[PDB]
């Protein structure tokens, strides 16, 4: 099998730019014909894949002349100017030319922006949870630039990097900004053996730290 | 237009069996080669199997060979998946794919794909989602905006519906990815809306989870103390 690379994974562009995704073969995609049957696709959340540039180079219909593909031998590159805010997703290489056909890891286009620090709200366990044995600690961290950012757990000062389970959402396409929301899975017991709970967001780098606590 | 509409996915435990559905229109079907192609969970594409026009010839990879079979049907303009013998690695949305025309030349391989049909094989059972209220506790510090949030959590499979006031909130809406906890999935959402209107206006969230025929109404009430 043909293994293709692309990197990098995720690229940050100002719109109006240029972006360069590159796409690597671990061996030759000539096909007996001498003809490189190497396809990139873009996908955008929700829908399907759909078909840029075939055979290395070609623009398929309704495909924007700012797309241009080209590349050798085990090397493919695509580039894209002018870069527009519907040519955000995610890119895909492909090769026709020996089975079985492959695809690449995928190269997200996501777009650059102001930075901005986090809004954080903490939430203790709802009483219905209590009822039922179990107690999570949820902590959002709203509409912040850019997708990197530390979350710090602390439970009566001690830090706690266990049982927490992180969620990112895809970058907003309205102002593009990330959120995440941070949970800590508890025991009830465990819960009530402790009265400070605090979530904090860390940039440094940035904004310097948010904190954000509650006791009972 | 040209179209392809898949069909047939849903929950099998492993070893088990089903099959796949995909419609074809605006096209002479039997023209046209047709593939299968899987995306999984980690967002990677896979070729899957291959059908002629003619439906001679087939072709599948070895992750798949013996497994699966590729099948059409051309005076219904109908291909079919038959998937047997499925284990949690064949968990994916199935897309249907043509790639060539039988008739010269040859390029540009898939152009139309279709919507695509979720296959998920697991031996965890079908759990509906608990329903969480998460309001701010009784001495947090107030500003012009309150976020307020569900958690939803321990349920299977994917997916669910989440909205807040029926729909007619959908400002400052954040609804996170679920998350695999232990062959269960949780997630949460969050809205966040003006001061005043919170808790002299009521919110509620409501969550469908069709899988379980489960829906739920949850009203975010301050919390005393």
């Known amino acids: 099998d043909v293994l293709m690379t692309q990197s990098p994974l995720s690229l940050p562009v100002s719109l109006g730019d240029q972006a360069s995704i590159s796409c690597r073969c671990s061996?030759?995609?000539?096909?007996?014909?001498?003809?490189?049957?190497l396809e990139w696709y873009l996908q955008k959340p929700g829908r399907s894949p759909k078909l840029l540039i075939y055979k290395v180079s070609n623009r398929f219909s309704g495909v924007p002349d700012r797309f241009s593909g080209s590349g050798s031998g085990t090397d493919f590159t695509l580039r894209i100017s002018r870069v527009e805010a519907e040519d955000l997703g995610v890119y895909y290489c492909f090769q026709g030319s020996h089975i079985p056909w492959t695809f690449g890891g995928g190269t997200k286009l996501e777009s650059k922006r102001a930075d901005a620090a986090p809004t954080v709200s903490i939430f203790p366990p709802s009483s219905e949870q209590l009822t039922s044995g179990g107690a999570s600690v949820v902590c959002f961290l709203n509409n912040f630039y850019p997708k990197d950012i530390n979350v710090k757990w602390k439970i009566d000062g001690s830090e706690r990097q266990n049982g927490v389970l992180n969620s990112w959402t895809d970058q907003d396409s309205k102002d593009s900004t990330y959120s995440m929301s941070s949970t800590l899975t508890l025991t009830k017991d465990e819960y009530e053996r402790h009265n400070s709970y605090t979530c904090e967001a860390t940039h440094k780098t940035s904004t310097s730290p948010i904190v954000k606590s509650f006791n009972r | 237009d040209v179209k392809l509409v898949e069909s047939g996915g849903g929950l099998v435990k492993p070893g088990g069996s089903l099959r796949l559905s995909c419609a074809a229109s605006?096209?002479?079907?039997?023209?046209?080669?047709m593939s299968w192609v899987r995306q999984t969970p980690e967002k990677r594409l896979e070729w899957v199997a291959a059908?002629?026009?003619?439906?001679?010839?087939?072709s599948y990879p070895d992750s798949v060979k013996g497994r699966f079979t590729i099948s059409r049907d051309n005076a219904k303009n109908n291909l079919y998946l038959q998937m047997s013998s499925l284990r949690s690695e064949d968990t994916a949305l199935y897309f249907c794919?043509?790639?060539?025309?039988?008739?010269?030349?040859?390029?540009?391989?898939?152009?139309?794909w279709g919507a695509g049909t979720t296959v998920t094989a697991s031996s965890a059972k079908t759990t509906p989602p608990s329903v969480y209220p998460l309001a701010p506790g009784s001495a947090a510090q107030t500003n012009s905006m309150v976020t307020l949030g569900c958690l939803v959590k321990g349920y299977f499979p994917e997916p669910v519906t989440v909205t807040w006031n029926s729909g007619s909130l959908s400002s400052g809406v954040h609804t996170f990815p679920a998350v695999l906890q232990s062959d269960l999935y949780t997630l949460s959402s969050s809205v966040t809306v003006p001061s005043s209107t919170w808790p002299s206006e009521t919110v509620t969230c409501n969550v469908a989870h069709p899988a379980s025929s489960t829906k739920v109404d949850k009203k975010i009430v301050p919390r005393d103390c």
């Open positions: 605006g096209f002479t079907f039997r023209n046209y080669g």
């Open positions: 794919a043509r790639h060539d025309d039988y008739y010269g030349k040859s390029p540009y391989f898939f152009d139309v």
């Open positions: 061996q030759s995609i000539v096909k007996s014909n001498g003809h490189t049957y």
């Open positions: 059908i002629s026009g003619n439906s001679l010839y087939t």
